[PDB]
Amino acid sequence: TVLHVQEIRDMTPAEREAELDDLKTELLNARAVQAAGGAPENPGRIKELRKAIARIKTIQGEEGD
Amino acid sequence: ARSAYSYIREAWKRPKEGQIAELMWHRMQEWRNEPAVVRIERPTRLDRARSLGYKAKQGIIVVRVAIRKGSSRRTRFNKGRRSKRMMVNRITRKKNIQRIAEERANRKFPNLRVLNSYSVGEDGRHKWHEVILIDPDHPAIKSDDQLSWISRTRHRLRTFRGLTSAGRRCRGLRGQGKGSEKVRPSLRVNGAKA
Amino acid sequence: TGAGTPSQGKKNTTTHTKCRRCGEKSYHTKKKVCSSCGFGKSAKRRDYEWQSKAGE
Amino acid sequence: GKKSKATKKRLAKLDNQNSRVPAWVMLKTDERNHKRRHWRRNDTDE
Amino acid sequence: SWDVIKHPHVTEKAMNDMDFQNKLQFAVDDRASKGEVADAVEEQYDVTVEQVNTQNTMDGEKKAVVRLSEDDDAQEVASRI
Amino acid sequence: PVYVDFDVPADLEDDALEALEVARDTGAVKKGTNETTKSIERGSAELVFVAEDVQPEEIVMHIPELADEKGVPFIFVEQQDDLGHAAGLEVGSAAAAVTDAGAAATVLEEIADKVEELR
RNA sequence: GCUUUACUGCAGGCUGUCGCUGAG
RNA sequence: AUACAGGGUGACAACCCCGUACUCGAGACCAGUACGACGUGCGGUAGUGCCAGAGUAGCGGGGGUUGGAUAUCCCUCGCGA
RNA sequence: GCACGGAGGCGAAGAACCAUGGAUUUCCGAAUGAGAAUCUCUAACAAUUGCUUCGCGCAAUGAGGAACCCCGAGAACUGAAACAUCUCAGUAUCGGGAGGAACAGAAAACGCAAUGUGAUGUCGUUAGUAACCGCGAGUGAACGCGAUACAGCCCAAACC
Ligand SMILES: [Cl-]
Ligand SMILES: [Cl-]
Ligand SMILES: [K+]
Ligand SMILES: [Mg+2]
Ligand SMILES: [Mg+2]
Ligand SMILES: [Mg+2]
Ligand SMILES: [Mg+2]
Ligand SMILES: [Mg+2]
Ligand SMILES: [Mg+2]
Ligand SMILES: [Mg+2]
Ligand SMILES: [Mg+2]
Ligand SMILES: [Mg+2]
Ligand SMILES: [Mg+2]
Ligand code: NA
Ligand code: NA
Ligand code: NA
Ligand code: NA
Ligand code: NA
Ligand code: NA
Ligand code: NA
Ligand code: NA
Ligand code: NA
Ligand code: NA
Ligand code: NA
Ligand code: NA
Ligand code: NA
């Protein structure tokens, strides 16, 4: 959603990796908040975070990194 | 004029006479100390081989195989058997020793396929046959207009299906007429009565 | 001693276990052979024609 | 008995499958766990 | 590729270790060694790992008790997540 | 071995091969057992060479007697590849035939004599 | 299931012969 | 209505909905086949005993198999053009 | 998703959904570096092979699959109103192996004997005929004919 395919393709191999490691962190912090019975959740995103990471990984592969 | 080959053939018509007789007596001594399946650089009976399909080419292999002589090495029945079926000494397998050789040779070279085979003698308890195998994956054979047919997938494991020379012969498929009623097109299709 | 109830008491030996290959609990840990799929004995899978009616 | 890491994983899964169908699924399906296994009454594999 | 740290194991006992012993507990990938857990931990939270204790749980997961150096403070490191 | 009834001294063999080389250049030679056999049969062979390291021996067994009942002279060579090389081949050769020597009909004729004497 | 000089066969043991197998 | 096959729809539906007749499109199989073409060269006369697949053809012992009987097919032992 | 809850989210940046193609595709598993009840130990075509730059460099095999197919091994209950040959039956079951079909196949054939037919399967018939058999119980073709579909070729050798 908030992160579309075009935008991923408009990134440089280095920006994808930086974005990648960024999403991963948001994800990890989401799981922590969840692991702590944290209610300030928004289920729709922890799900999107996974998909976004998938897309980036998919693109990194299509572009050759 | 006579080919040089014709001589090798003439000699092998009476393997117990003249020079070949002495050769055998010599050879067999080394053969007896050799294994079950031994690849040999050249065919002992060159005329034969070439006549079977042999070619001094890449992808063509020849091997001598040693098999024990005689009838079925058959375990007696451990339960109820009518007299007729109580047999052990006189039963003999329905596949000939030459065919056993082909299979043994072939198993030794899993990637190769049996082209043909011929006998090269026997002593008191062995029988030896030389098998001609072919490497269906080696170009030069893939590209040989005379052997490329064996490369076909339909030919995987010819021997084990009796597609061989001795295979068809042993299956009773020699005659096209009288007597092959229960033979053609297959033993199994004819209820196995030949 | 009764071969019955009283002889059931010594049965605390482990034999057939969860098979790595077929997932059945038929891997005889002492034989290292699966009684279900043949793993450990045959590369090909265990199977027999008598596992069903002759015409089926 | 001495359990291996694998064995331990399996027993663990078995324990987890031993939970009940969550209440919400009842409501979502407008209306049973047939794989309920008691440690004493039932026997696991291996 | 699998990641080393899965998430923070937060339970009453985990709290006690954190408040009284300066330790952090985590759910980690069971293929991870103490060494790997130590490194992964330092790089993610920028601290100094002093010791790691592991346990393969009856939950199918691996738990790591990570003690930080007196220089670092578990209570704080954990408060930002 | 079984078809070899007399040993040819190293030196004789050398004179033989040498003659063979000049034969391919000055005269005519047949390379290979089959071609050789036909020379002896067609009578066009003057001197035939037979290797002693041939396996199987069947390939050559016939040369001797065949050449005897055709009057054709023959000599043994130890190495199969030397005969091949001498005949001008990159490969070995179990048997060769000097079909009408060349600038060697002399040396040759005499090798034939030396062998006949070698019994 | 068992037995035997019940019937018929089968291993196995003994023995002759042929092949392996040659010289005086 | 070239559509009255069948189904759905709060009860028995050609005309409420899906579809059905008609027409049309796509994929797969037929098939790397048929047809077409490229290269090659078929065939005939006279002369010539140059060539043409061996443990084979064939015989005997013993077994198995077959409708195969003397006259099936196969295996084994021995002999062998 | 089945799955009709709660919360939240995605979709006109054309989502859901469908087709085709592509990415990802843990561990065991033929399971192939080695060991192991799905894990572990310190680079790996393990094993057997072909080719070979003789170095795992280039390749092959392995195992699956509903039955069908081909090659091997091969019962007994039963029938014969007992039972041995015979029958059940080359059935059941076992070992090996191929393909999308297998197998067979261009006559050392047939032998309505001919001035005749003309590769091979299969279907129908020929026929329960010929043939077998304690000549008992049983067993049991083929040539030909009518159809289906059609297709004919390559070596070995001579001479080079
Ligand atoms: Cl094969
Ligand atoms: Cl006719
Ligand atoms: K019976
Ligand atoms: Mg008892
Ligand atoms: Mg619990
Ligand atoms: Mg520990
Ligand atoms: Mg019978
Ligand atoms: Mg392994
Ligand atoms: Mg009866
Ligand atoms: Mg009667
Ligand atoms: Mg058929
Ligand atoms: Mg019958
Ligand atoms: Mg007939
Ligand atoms: Na093979
Ligand atoms: Na038969
Ligand atoms: Na229990
Ligand atoms: Na967890
Ligand atoms: Na009894
Ligand atoms: Na016989
Ligand atoms: Na996949
Ligand atoms: Na491989
Ligand atoms: Na290699
Ligand atoms: Na009766
Ligand atoms: Na009775
Ligand atoms: Na009878
Ligand atoms: Na007629």
From Swiss-Prot, chain A:
Keywords: Ribonucleoprotein, Ribosomal protein, RNA-binding, rRNA-binding. It holds the Pfam family Ribosomal_L29. It comes from the Archaea. GO terms for molecular function: rRNA binding; structural constituent of ribosome. One of its GO terms (biological process) is translation. PROSITE patterns: RIBOSOMAL_L29 (PS00579). GO terms for cellular component: cytosolic large ribosomal subunit. The keyword Heme does not apply. Stabilizes the tertiary rRNA structure within the 23S rRNA domain (domain I) to which it binds. Located at the polypeptide exit tunnel on the outside of the subunit. Belongs to the universal ribosomal protein uL29 family. This is Large ribosomal subunit protein uL29. It comes from Haloarcula marismortui (strain ATCC 43049 / DSM 3752 / JCM 8966 / VKM B-1809).
Swiss-Prot record, chain C:
One of its GO terms (biological process) is translation. Keywords: Metal-binding, Ribonucleoprotein, Ribosomal protein, RNA-binding, rRNA-binding, Zinc, Zinc-finger. A zinc finger (C4-type) spans 19-37. Its cofactor is Zn(2+). Zn(2+) binds at C19, C22, C34, C37. The keyword Transport does not apply. Gene3D superfamilies: 2.20.25.30. Binds 1 zinc ion per subunit. Residues 1-25 are annotated as: Disordered. It comes from the Archaea. It holds the Pfam family Ribosomal_L37e. InterPro entries: Ribosomal_eL37, Ribosomal_eL37/eL43, Ribosomal_eL37_CS, Ribosomal_zn-bd. Residues 1-16 have a biased composition (Polar residues). The keyword Metal-binding applies. GO terms for cellular component: cytosolic large ribosomal subunit. GO terms for molecular function: rRNA binding; structural constituent of ribosome; zinc ion binding. Part of the 50S ribosomal subunit. Interacts weakly with protein L4. Binds to the 23S rRNA. Belongs to the eukaryotic ribosomal protein eL37 family. This is Large ribosomal subunit protein eL37. The gene is rpl37e.
UniProtKB/Swiss-Prot annotation, chain E:
GO terms for molecular function: rRNA binding; structural constituent of ribosome. GO terms for cellular component: ribonucleoprotein complex; ribosome. It comes from the Archaea. Gene3D superfamilies: 3.30.70.330. NCBIfam families: PRK14548.1, uL23_arch. Belongs to the universal ribosomal protein uL23 family. This is Large ribosomal subunit protein uL23. The gene is rpl23.
Swiss-Prot record, chain F:
Part of the 50S ribosomal subunit. Interacts with protein L15e. Probably part of the RNase P complex. PROSITE patterns: RIBOSOMAL_L7AE. One of its GO terms (cellular component) is ribosome. Keywords: Cytoplasm, Ribonucleoprotein, Ribosomal protein, RNA-binding, rRNA-binding, tRNA processing. GO terms for molecular function: ribonuclease P activity; rRNA binding; structural constituent of ribosome. The lineage of its organism: Archaea, Methanobacteriati, Methanobacteriota, Stenosarchaea group, Halobacteria. It comes from the Archaea. Multifunctional RNA-binding protein that recognizes the K-turn motif in ribosomal RNA, the RNA component of RNase P, box H/ACA, box C/D and box C'/D' sRNAs. GO terms for biological process: ribosome biogenesis; translation; tRNA 5'-leader removal. The gene is rpl7ae. It is found in: Cytoplasm. This is Large ribosomal subunit protein eL8. Belongs to the eukaryotic ribosomal protein eL8 family.
